[PDB]
Amino acid sequence: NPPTFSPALLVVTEGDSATFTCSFSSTSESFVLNWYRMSPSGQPDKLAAFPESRFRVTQLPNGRDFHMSVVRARRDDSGTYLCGAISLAPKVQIKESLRAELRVTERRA
Amino acid sequence: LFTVTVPKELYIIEHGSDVTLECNFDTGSHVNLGAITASLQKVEDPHRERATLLEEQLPLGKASFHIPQVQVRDEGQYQCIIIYGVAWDYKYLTLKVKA
Ligand SMILES: [Mg+2]
Predict the structure, then answer these.
(1) Does the distance separating the beta carbons of A93 and B41 come in below 8 Å?
(2) Distance (Å) from CA A108 to ligand 1 centroid
(3) Domains and CATH numbers, chain B
(4) What domain range is A39 assigned to?
(5) Gaps after residue numbers in chain B (C–N over 2.5 angstroms)
(6) Count of the separate structural domains present in chain A
(7) Are A14 and A100 in contact (CB under 8 A)?
(8) d(CA A73, CA A21)
(9) What family is this protein classified in (chain B)?
(10) Residues A84/A43, Cβ–Cβ less than 8 Å
């Protein structure tokens, strides 16, 4: 029930869109779903969220899957990403997905 | 986007001294909250658990958590979590306890 986040390794060409999929569902809580990039030091930087730009988050028809996309990937977008949910029970806690890697490759001449 | 930042991510405190751990939050509208929750959650942790929110500093845009007389058990990583309506964000803080 932590969200899942796939693929674990996403490789695109610079200039193309890069799309991860986050999966999560709560029958008992609202809360917004967040998309993060992890810094060198390991701090999560909030990129976008649903429901709340270079980054786009959209809800697919089945209700529990979300596309999280870098709309036009740049070389410097390569890095570590995850999605997180929050719950209040039994205490306040972030539930981070497993972390996935984006690699943006140089487009040929 | 509602965001949380940590201007100081590492606290190094002498054993048995107090510490105030902090993270800031950024919003573009007057801070309407009693809509704000903040919590400091120890990663490793189990509860009487210890760090208490100082509510009076929320209008300054800070979530401050005080721990008295830190012990070996207080050492480790924490998530600073701030909720605003249904929006939220968090950062990691580390507390190290010297002798
Ligand atoms: Mg290039």
Answers:
(1) yes
(2) 9
(3) 1-99 (2.60.40.10)
(4) 1-109
(5) 45
(6) 1
(7) no
(8) 16
(9) Belongs to the immunoglobulin superfamily. BTN/MOG family.
(10) no
